[model samples]
Target: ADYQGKNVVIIGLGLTGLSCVDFFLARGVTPRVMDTRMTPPGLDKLPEAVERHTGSLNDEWLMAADLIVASPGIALAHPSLSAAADAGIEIVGDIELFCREAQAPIVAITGSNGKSTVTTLVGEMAKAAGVNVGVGGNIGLPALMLLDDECELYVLELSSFQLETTSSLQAVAATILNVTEDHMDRYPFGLQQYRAAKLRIYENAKVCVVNADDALTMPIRGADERCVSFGVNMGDYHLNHQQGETWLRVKGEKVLNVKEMKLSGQHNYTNALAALALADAAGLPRASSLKALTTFTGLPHRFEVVLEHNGVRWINDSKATNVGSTEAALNGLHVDGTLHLLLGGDGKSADFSPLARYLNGDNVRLYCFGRDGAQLAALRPEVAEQTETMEQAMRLLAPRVQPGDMVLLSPACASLDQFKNFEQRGNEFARLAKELGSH
Candidate 1:
């Protein structure tokens, strides 16, 4: 609330930066924006209300601020951020600002994957329980823009980048859906740095929901935080498959029938369990969370069905930007469907060798694109097939795909090599798939 009439300098003209400008502007705070690019693409989408400093973040205008908000993608190593740090200027992310001003309790969710799914599902569950909730952060609209005084709770889908700059955030309840090797480039190749960033959410969280299967989340070190564990397999809290449906259990008795959950795949079952765990921790009805899970449609560009033709489905899973996530997406494929696994794109350097075991057997075929194509092609002798472009891959795949064979565009890499971002890459994949289906 102290943001009113304050001088705020926002670094990086990315989504988070623009959202910060909009948020502060609405609050009567004047924000001056700066980015490393002369004509930042992010700034092109913004209104003319904010002053824009082009070319390099070290512009003199940055020093004239009471507070500085840095975007997630801008590394702390950046000169502007370093300069701010040297000057002792207070810095925070958009999520931190939202948390400080929120008129309602916050329920923050963060993990390497499934964070979006869990965040959206939790929002649906809150709505099902008749609680006013605003869901945003890494998923929907930026969190700051979603702030409203009358909302009862705010569910935030946080990423490790957002978590790094955020402090003073004590979610009424929080959960680490899961963690894995990701964003290695940002953390100097030390995985613990990424884990530490994620653990910050639980620092002040009243109840910390953790994954039972992931060793990183289990045996949590934080003190005085009430912890609840959820897992796909047997755990202190478990989500089990019963009679072809998923169910959540506490100490072995089924508490929620998760089979009716709208999302597909085992990962989603875990997400449902995580959401249900948070709901229970918050004292909400378990039945309400189950009812909400039954109706939740899931997030976009994440296992979205772009087209289904000749009994072959084309799925858009652009959000799976790492090998681990791609494996999860592939693992969730219907066993009956021969998966034409589309993989590749830009991403942090990682070993693709782990995919070899998953590629074996009759369940799936491999089609790769972007930078990973060559590396993936080398594995063709062991896997199924490989391709270099989405268009070419789809064309070659269309004729070969049979009934119950799926064509999935779930590239386990970033979209920077060929497209602006994952969303653009996903949209292009969907467009190409629809056009191919028509022909």
Candidate 2:
């Protein structure tokens, strides 16, 4: 892939696009860019070496390119990728490009809900194990940015979009945390397609860390690979709650204390198990990984504890935009106190039945918001008593919640209906929860 002197056309002018330009130009390969955003606003930051072409990616660029590296942000059916596919241009993504060049051992994790948590945990675990590690891909930085430096390992959190365009993004160790119905719209409303896309992260992996409980993640068909099975159940590497603390075991040997684990919920314990298993598979000491998991604070907005007031805990889980995410959030709570589970937003096409069972429980009350709220109210006759407007949901539930009760804003749907992104929705929930708490 001698892109030097040859014009490589990069589609999509997002973070990865800028990173690709920077990476290629440093290697003496000058690439021309074609972005759908006529004025993408960030084109000025590109080095003078990059030639920017505004508007849709045209066939002319495809005809002239030596290669086409599409960003993960763009869909496969995207015009630029379609153009390249139609023209038979050599195509790859930033992940693939990194895979082809990176000298560091790749440790990749992909799943519907906990990719970021597990990936970040793996990096911390590696660092604690005394290895020089770089963490990137779908989180803090793009994998391309880490290509210039050499490290002992690389912890990557890849999304389905990134995995879709990747062929060379093989990992020395990989984990599929748990695949559920996610990004269905991206794959023509097919859950299986999305699952297949997630499974791509494990291709050519030396060790495939499979979630023992998830139907989509288990029953893996990889050949002769050393797999570390992890689950909340007493599986190979078990993460179980005993007494007041959570503990992780490797082949029935106590490795890490679960109570010392940083993040909340059983979902996070599962995530830790996946990371711990990978670290173990990679020959890193289990004790080192456990130490890191204990101290890691976790990424923002995945059930983040924003504030607590008047005995009510306000949690921001705006990232839980699907049923699986919401389920994780609901199940993540210790659930000893009343969990006023916030539901609604721009609805994703998923059954509300899973949340239904929890709603029927006495300890959990359903708070409906946005379009989905109406639908949720209609579907669950029992939750109708607790359902109300977002503000009303907060105000009413606040009084009912005891000292240990949790006020959770884990909208099981997208936020486009009532707000901007999930961050805005979560922040608003925090603001309102704060105002009510103060009162």
Candidate 3:
């Protein structure tokens, strides 16, 4: 009951804010909300009892808060939030708030890429097992929104940003899929900054699940430790190739085969392994997990293979808005001929320099488009083509692709600058590839 009589100020009048608002109101308290905009989105939904602050976040009211619930959109390092934190005030995200009231076992997942696919798969597996589970947090809805009365357990797709404010997320099992060049743009110290935030998920988790290949997720938990791992050929859950049959293994025992999964790409297979580990740790039946894995088509826009024409495959991984994801896409693909890679979008001022190493080989032929097209094209100027948009990039590269080749749209950037969102961009790419490949 630490928050019994606290002055609660919720930042950002969005879905998170409203959910936090509802949380406080349901607890017999009214919370104040803040937004920098003149009128923030979902303003109309703001409860009558909740006070609203607009335009400026810095004020005596924010500094006077006994507790602050922040949206992921606001930085923990923001001047006001920093000043508040330095003043000995407590700041918690909606996730943290949800944790305080949650009674069910939680499956916490965080990583640079494949997290959405992994988080979503875990939820589906939970459902297949007939466990009443609610999935949210970073995937779509607010965490507080999933704090339903009937749910027996939960699945959360956590980002480092959300992890930053969450201190009490005690999970039944937690996994960090893979840490890359670390989404270099976010944390000031680069990889380690994002990593420290990611490692928070392991603190109160009963079982720790790390990536075996990327030792960064967990250094070296003792064999006695209640820890698990999922990876390519190693880890507790892994792919074992025996007599030319690729089987998904659990504790070195074959569970399923690679051919049985509807999803393509080795990265997805790795993601499925993590979901299986999480689902099992959360007490879902192994048969149910396997059933979900074989049927789970994968989350759209992450690594969807849209079309194939004349033996050339067209893939849509538009959700690969980070450098690590694009690298994963490039690494997993089987390119017999040239790989027509579609790159560029709103770069979010991230360091695309890490991709320089991957683009070096002749196999990948790059086509840059959208806002950061020129910047991405410069990664390999002579071989990479610069186009104004994704449609243009597809038009130019689709014709040049031969049989045994693949055209991949793994834009290592956000679609906001050119399209509605990643889904819109991905849908556009799928449609164009379908139409263009028909001939």
Candidate 4:
């Protein structure tokens, strides 16, 4: 669409918004950036040609716009957005904008956890198979920035927030790895509402990948819909243990040995299955997918081992910003050793009781910190220790953990309450653990 002289309103001046501004400006359309925060993180970085509006969104400005490009951070139900919707202003996000312009086939993945790993794995698989691919959406770069003439495939790690504004993605393959209670604070109506947003990825998807273990990921298939299933248990693609050896199997046929895979834990094995299924659905070579699986050790802040101190392993699973993610991290790492778990943060209004089940195993001790530390402590009073901050938690936990024990910072909530984000939180934990180990 010709965007010259169009009045575009870019909402929420974050990374997505900034990308929208650049996209529009390059096409001869100058955008007015609107954000609720008086001084959002990237306000100073915006070009001088762009107009800025802060505090509250103006209805008049939204109504005057030819298009409204919203950031994923802003809720769809915001009063101003609702008003603009009522007034029939074209509303879209960076993903929607990218989809409209992308010429290559797309593989989109979404879930409460594991999407990042699966997305990256699929991208690597494509590369190994000698396909030119662009990988980025919710992680790394914004989707719009990845658009290029040389791209053959686009692998995107989409979040529910981004999916909320995306409608015409039409991915070659799409998967919801699993869904658990997450981002509760954002969805006032609850998990069902949040889940519906995630299911959007499968809309118009040529191939649908479902997790057989998680019923929530199983979509009601249409007669014409092509579907693929993966899980830890029996399915189209699954992990099998035969004669004391674990293997990744496709249709009951052994493909790769789990023991040889670089990424540890059943969760990662499941991720490998999803990646393989997605790659196959996207027509990438199986050998290349398997090769990527064996080589990929997994991403940082997602069950990454930071250091080993005094025979105790310090892990930075700070990417576990929800109950489901933390559960996966704990389950994946909990074996032959005691777990000294560091938990807490914004909590995102998620139920802490689910974590209690893991703590009851007797191999776990919970060290809680940040905004919801005390609340999580109440869930498992027997094993829970409330510390006010991450530093204090590390200091308190250092002396208590022994050899063969793991000090894991898998906070089942966001780190924004105490630190900038999960990366900074994980970095600090790694730094503190390294400092203690040096002593």
RMSD of each: 2.5, 3.6, 3.0, 1.7
Best by TM-score: 4
Candidate order, TM-score descending:
4, 1, 3, 2
The residue-by-residue lDDT of candidate 3 on 72-142, one tens digit each, is 87888888889999999989999998888888899999988888888889999988988898999988778
lDDT of 3 at 279: 90
Candidate 4 C-alpha error for residue 221, in Å: 5.1
Q: In candidate 4, what are the lDDT values of residues 86-163, reduced to their tens digit?
A: 988888889999999999999999999988899999999999999999999997589999989899999999999999
Superposed model 2: Cα runs more than 4 Å off: 37-57, 219-223, 240-246, 332-339, 344-348, 361-405, 414-428
Please state the error at residue 22 of candidate 2 in Å: 2.5
In order, candidate lDDTs are: 0.79, 0.78, 0.85, 0.87
- Colliding residue pairs in candidate 3: none
Off by over 4 Å in 4: 221-224, 332-338, 361-363
Q: Write the per-residue lDDT of candidate 2 for residues 1-439, one digit (tens) a residue.
A: 4566777888877778999888887888778887877767457788875778877777787777778888875677876577668887788899988888888888988888888888888888888888988899987488988764658888898888889889986688887788777666578859888888888887778888888787687534643446668888766888656787777777777777766765767777778888888887777787787789899998777888888777777888888878888887655357567877777866666667777656656676777777768776655657554343567777767767778888888877877656645677777878887787776
lDDT of 2 at 333: 50
| Residue 119, model 3, lDDT | 89
My TM-score estimates for the predictions, one after another, are: 0.91, 0.85, 0.88, 0.96
Clashes of 3: 0
What's the residue-level lDDT of 367 in candidate 2? 72
